Amino acid sequence: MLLPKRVKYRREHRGKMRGRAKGGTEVHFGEFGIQALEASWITNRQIEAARIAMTRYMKRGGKVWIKIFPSKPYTAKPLEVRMGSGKGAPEGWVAVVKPGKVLFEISGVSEEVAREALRLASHKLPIKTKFVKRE
Amino acid sequence: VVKLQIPAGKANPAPPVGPALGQAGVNIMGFCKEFNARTADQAGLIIPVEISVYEDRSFTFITKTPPAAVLLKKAAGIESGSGEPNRNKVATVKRDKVREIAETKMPDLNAADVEAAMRMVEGTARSMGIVIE
Amino acid sequence: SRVGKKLLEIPSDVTVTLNDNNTVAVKGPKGELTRTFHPDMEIKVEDNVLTVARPSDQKEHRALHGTTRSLLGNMVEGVSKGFERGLELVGVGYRASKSGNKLVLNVGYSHPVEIVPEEGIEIEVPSQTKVVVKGTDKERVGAIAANIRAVRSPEPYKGKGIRYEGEVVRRKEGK
Amino acid sequence: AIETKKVVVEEIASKLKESKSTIIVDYRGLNVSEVTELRKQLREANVEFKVYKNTMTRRAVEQAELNGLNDFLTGPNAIAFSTEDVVAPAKVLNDFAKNHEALEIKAGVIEGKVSTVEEVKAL
Amino acid sequence: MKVRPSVKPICEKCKVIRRKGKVMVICENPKHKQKQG
RNA sequence: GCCGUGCUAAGCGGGGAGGUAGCGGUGCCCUGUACCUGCAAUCCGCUCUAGCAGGGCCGAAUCCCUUCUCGAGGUUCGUUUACUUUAAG
RNA sequence: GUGGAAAAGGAUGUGGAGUUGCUUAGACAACCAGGAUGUUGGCUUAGAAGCAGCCACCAUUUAAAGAGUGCGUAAUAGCU
């Protein structure tokens, strides 16, 4: 449940994704990070489910270090209506994710338990995913 | 061979030991007099008795020294020791008492020396947190 | 860590011959066993020395090269001494006995079960419960033993029916 | 791998000042037998006798080549090594002979160990 | 059997056998017997 | 101890397919002439083996142990009837 | 029968390119031996001693025994 408390315009374009991420190409703040390889939309519920997976498995840590925040609203028309007559109502929020984006960062937890936590939470996201460690 | 930690209180009835004495092939009541005669030398304690049956159907009974930390409860004054490890420490035992307890089991133990014996009693006492002075 | 290039030897008085390119016939004191392989293998018989030779070392050539030496060695002690599988049967009324050249079982069923050995592999009853199969080839002895076990496989709740000599069976408690 | 070289050279330093040794085969290692043997050698003599068992050919030839090149028979299998600096054994060797012959496992009917020169009938 | 398209060893006694085109597992515990597809 | 005055309690059935190296019990047979409600079997009270709450007991032991019994069941054999079901002749 | 229809996920399928400990002072397996003592770890079960858990992480000569990974009504067995 991650919410921008105020937005200029509550309806905006769906946008196009292509190419790698502009920033967040390296894990810098924690010591083990997780990376996206394929670009897609990731929602509030997916961020929250991954965070509950990581925190509840590790039961300890410095902190969780979510590295993306959803700002894009997406809209839906009400069900079974003739298509047109204006853009629909805002339904939820989406963090746009390009490849080469670190999604979650981990510090202070050892090798195999960090590997297990990140696998357990990367199974809860729709995108193909790779582990990474800090240089 | 079987082991039985027979106390000095009661060795007669069937609910405590029963078939452990029954299935050995030796009469249970026939050796209770010898068991009580051996126990009355060290009465007030729990003596382990090993019962061994040879190939010639001969029965041998060997009594041994009582287990460790039996006198530690009497030195503490509390019958049941602290079940929480190493933070509830009531029993403060002098090293003279530790040396006496080791000296009582110089024949029974297979430890090398008195230093090995005080290491043995440290390893036993560290489970319930008994202070050795 | 290799079983393929180790050496196997005829222990005593067991005759071996190669009558066709990859058909080997072995006559020991008990009987004669003859088998046929694909021609990619190579077998050479020195006096009390058997050597195997593969043309190339690759994934399934390694497998066949190992298994032909294992097979020939296993059948040569089989033709040397024969081989035993014992079968116990556990139950208060379960019975198995010998009827002529056949074996009869009565375990749970209204009809008795008949086993007819045809390949000259013997079955004997030293006791009512213990039964033994004795034969030349490990494959056929295992097949007959499995055929006896399939009459009644052992059941988990009470140890019952046919079982092997020393294997463990699963114990499930029924309340 | 050089820790092997340290334990080799300290065992050479032990066996150089070692005067006598006794054949013990490390098979049939039953607990009552080995505890009674160790307690009775504690009774008989000092603790100088060792429980070391490693008998690979890199060890025995390296011990033999400086002194006592008779370890070819003790090369295979497993033979524990006993070191005796204090008092010449005689009644101790007779004790080993009698408790090997009156049950309590065998020693190979005296394989022999070269104290200065000994191959046969260490008594 | 457990016909599941995800087959992984549950307990450490399990070992995987590549059999007939379907990667099964076999274990002493019969509950841990499964085969994909 | 002749006994009398104010009062009691251990205790008021077991055996034999039973359950824990564990007693009681809601099949079964017995003497019953010894009391009643509940819990208690793909189960409950429960551990010197007494099933757990109260009361009907003059009230202490003839009812706590000892030849004081055969007998009412659990048995390798029953070649001694004979029935009944599958088959070596 | 891919070619000649399709995903998250699963795998000792297989061909290439690497990295890393053992690597003949004898490795990984196989077989033969070893598996104890304080100590039956407490304390609720007069049953638990690995058969539930407040719970330690000792020392012996061991480079072998951890107060323990396993048939086991609860220990006691060919057993790992």
XYZ file of C-alpha atoms in Angstrom, chain B:
133
model
C 23.656 -56.716 30.588
C 21.118 -54.215 31.965
C 21.408 -51.130 34.166
C 19.060 -50.149 36.994
C 19.405 -47.004 39.120
C 17.983 -48.596 42.263
C 17.278 -46.071 45.047
C 17.647 -46.861 48.727
C 13.944 -46.173 49.345
C 12.192 -49.171 47.785
C 13.457 -52.056 45.658
C 10.692 -54.591 46.387
C 7.510 -53.818 44.379
C 6.586 -54.470 40.733
C 5.265 -51.003 39.517
C 8.786 -49.374 39.638
C 10.955 -52.062 37.957
C 8.762 -55.103 37.223
C 9.524 -56.861 33.939
C 13.072 -55.446 33.813
C 13.876 -57.754 36.722
C 11.340 -60.352 35.571
C 12.632 -61.052 32.057
C 16.273 -61.568 33.082
C 15.635 -65.227 33.942
C 16.645 -64.734 37.587
C 14.304 -64.790 40.582
C 13.357 -61.254 41.601
C 12.704 -61.914 45.300
C 15.741 -64.192 45.643
C 18.255 -61.346 45.354
C 16.379 -58.463 47.025
C 18.082 -59.378 50.316
C 21.516 -59.017 48.701
C 20.372 -55.814 46.970
C 19.267 -54.337 50.305
C 22.485 -55.512 51.997
C 24.577 -53.794 49.320
C 22.327 -50.713 49.382
C 22.401 -50.258 53.179
C 26.126 -49.451 53.012
C 25.284 -46.380 50.887
C 21.685 -45.887 52.063
C 20.147 -42.524 51.298
C 21.358 -42.633 47.677
C 20.528 -44.133 44.278
C 23.018 -46.880 43.401
C 23.295 -48.079 39.788
C 23.337 -51.867 39.548
C 24.423 -53.688 36.394
C 22.930 -57.165 35.983
C 24.865 -59.374 33.567
C 23.985 -62.898 32.426
C 26.906 -65.021 31.277
C 26.846 -67.822 28.708
C 26.745 -70.364 31.566
C 23.436 -68.854 32.854
C 25.220 -67.207 35.793
C 23.929 -63.878 37.096
C 26.336 -61.190 38.305
C 25.301 -57.948 40.007
C 27.765 -55.040 40.072
C 27.037 -51.906 42.093
C 28.543 -48.565 41.105
C 28.887 -45.047 42.460
C 25.764 -42.829 42.284
C 25.454 -40.389 39.349
C 26.768 -36.848 39.397
C 24.961 -33.812 40.880
C 23.149 -35.941 43.476
C 24.960 -34.201 46.335
C 24.844 -30.889 44.442
C 21.110 -30.613 45.144
C 21.778 -31.304 48.833
C 24.525 -28.662 48.868
C 22.140 -26.196 47.210
C 19.314 -27.083 49.593
C 16.855 -27.357 46.678
C 15.862 -30.792 45.385
C 15.086 -29.700 41.809
C 17.716 -27.604 40.075
C 17.156 -24.565 37.901
C 15.771 -25.644 34.542
C 16.825 -22.406 32.878
C 20.451 -22.503 31.645
C 23.162 -20.330 33.188
C 21.119 -17.306 34.315
C 19.364 -18.731 37.399
C 22.381 -19.634 39.539
C 21.518 -20.586 43.119
C 23.955 -23.422 43.885
C 27.323 -21.921 44.856
C 29.602 -24.914 45.448
C 33.083 -24.656 46.932
C 36.052 -26.206 45.154
C 36.683 -28.336 48.251
C 33.235 -29.894 47.767
C 34.004 -30.231 44.042
C 37.261 -32.032 44.897
C 35.421 -34.334 47.322
C 32.757 -35.141 44.702
C 35.497 -35.920 42.163
C 37.378 -38.051 44.718
C 34.241 -40.130 45.275
C 34.308 -41.037 41.552
C 38.040 -41.535 40.986
C 37.415 -45.310 40.481
C 34.145 -45.030 38.540
C 35.056 -42.462 35.886
C 37.334 -43.014 32.897
C 38.699 -39.467 33.105
C 42.459 -38.998 33.064
C 42.998 -36.837 36.145
C 41.451 -34.605 38.798
C 41.622 -31.744 36.285
C 39.644 -33.887 33.835
C 37.183 -34.655 36.655
C 36.634 -30.985 37.503
C 36.168 -30.379 33.774
C 33.580 -33.193 33.872
C 31.670 -31.596 36.734
C 31.895 -28.196 35.015
C 30.348 -29.721 31.891
C 27.561 -31.262 33.947
C 26.977 -28.180 36.124
C 26.868 -25.726 33.203
C 23.581 -27.241 31.987
C 21.622 -26.004 35.021
C 24.006 -23.196 36.010
C 25.673 -24.312 39.253
C 28.356 -21.925 40.523
C 31.710 -23.553 41.313
C 33.801 -21.463 43.703
